[PDB]
């Protein structure tokens, strides 16, 4: 006990904390290992995802090497602050912290061969720009970028410890509106004016779930358009009936579009769902204009040719519109 105490104090003694291991020698080599716990809500409005993980950095420091005391020591909160650790940081994070309750979720373990293992429990909100042009039929690519802040590749090299097995816990993710199709681990040397900095990238590919939108967006619009087509089969002299039908279908379409864009994320630029809804709106508007033409031509100014043409052309045109939309966006 006291032997361990005085040996740890001696290990602290003679240690320069501002100097990395092997300052004049070859660069330090740090192996990263991530254990994902969960991916929380993913925001289209903010274009970011919140990720919780256990982040581990493994390296070798000959300064912190001891002989005897076969057990591997474990510094916890106070003397841990008196050791050099890499200045690793997440390039694209927007807000992150180490969990505090009950105690600081940090760990430092020193093996007798000078090896150091530094574990942290980190929650981080990372930026993920999204291509919301095929929304809700879109597929996204989010990334987490890990980089050294001050040291270039000549001083520190990073790598994935364990190779492709470095990152674990991907299966634990249970996002409601997204499914993780694939993930990748990449290592690069980004070149700045100062020099080549190390970089690691943990990338996920997400595919959105579509049945929600099929249930609440595409089906009601199609049903409302089919209802709007009923005017062509209603008698042409039923002015109040046909006018009420057409204008109320238009009102229902506007109601659907407005409340849909209220409940959906803001997303202040064009999507695919907007084009589909606008197509349905134009179809019902054209149906009402068709009745207006009928009323002016006949009964104003043996079914009539205008309605006979409408009955066959409107479903046919809507089918072609659906075909073009689905082929273009799928």
């Amino acid at each position, epitope marked *: 006990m006291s032997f361990v105490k005085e040996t740890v104090d001696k290990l602290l003694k003679g240690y320069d904390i501002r100097l990395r291991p092997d300052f004049g020698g070859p660069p330090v080599c740090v192996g990263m290992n991530i254990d994902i716990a969960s991916i929380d809500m993913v925001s289209e409005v903010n274009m970011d995802y919140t990720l919780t993980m256990y982040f581990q950095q493994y390296w070798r420091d000959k300064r912190l090497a001891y002989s005897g005391i076969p057990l591997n020591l474990t510094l916890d909160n106070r003397v841990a602050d008196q050791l050099w650790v890499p200045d690793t940081y997440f390039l694209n994070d927007k807000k992150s912290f180490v969990h505090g309750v009950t105690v600081k979720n940090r760990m430092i373990r020193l093996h007798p061969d000078g090896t150091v293992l530094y574990g942290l429990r980190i929650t981080t909100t990372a930026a993920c720009m999204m291509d919301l042009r095929r929304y809700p039929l879109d597929e996204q690519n989010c990334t987490l970028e890990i980089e050294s802040y001050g040291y270039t590749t000549d001083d520190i090299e990073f790598y994935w410890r364990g190779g492709d097995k470095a990152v674990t816990g991907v299966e634990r*993710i*249970e996002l409601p509106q997204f499914s993780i199709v694939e993930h990748r681990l990449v290592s690069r040397n980004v070149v700045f004016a100062t020099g080549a900095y190390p970089r690691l990238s943990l990338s996920f590919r997400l595919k959105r779930n579509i049945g929600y939108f099929i249930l609440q967006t595409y089906m009601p619009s199609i049903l409302i358009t089919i209802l709007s087509w009923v005017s062509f089969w209603i008698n042409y002299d039923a002015s109040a009936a046909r006018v009420a039908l057409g204008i109320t279908t238009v009102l229902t379409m506007t109601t659907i579009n407005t409340h849909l864009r209220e409940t959906l994320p803001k997303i202040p630029y064009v999507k695919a769902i907007d084009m589909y809804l606008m197509g349905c709106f134009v179809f019902v508007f054209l149906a009402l204009l068709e009745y207006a033409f009928v009323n002016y031509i006949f009964f104003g100014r043996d079914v009539n040719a205008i309605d006979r043409w409408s009955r066959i052309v409107f479903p046919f045109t809507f089918s072609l519109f659906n075909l073009v939309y689905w082929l273009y966006y799928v």
Partner: nanobody
Amino acid sequence: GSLRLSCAASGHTFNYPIMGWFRQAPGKEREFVGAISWSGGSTSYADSVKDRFTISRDNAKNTVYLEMNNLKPEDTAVYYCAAKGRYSGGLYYPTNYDYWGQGTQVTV
């Protein structure tokens, strides 16, 4: 040799999302063959049989399919299916898995 095993789950399947396939040859202990998540993505296979086997899922009927393309004579064993909690731990350790199956037999 196209063999397809099927592990069907009933009950509170949501509370035990991850499902893992193991194999136990005669004499040898249980070995982790594969694991599949709830949503059907992010499958994880062992090093020995990473490319030979493929695991699929369909929650509409609560069943997990383990396909095998090319079988070797070291693969003769009793194949088990198991379920794991959401905060159990690692995938490769059978102790973390709570509910096991009787297990089928395969010989080649």
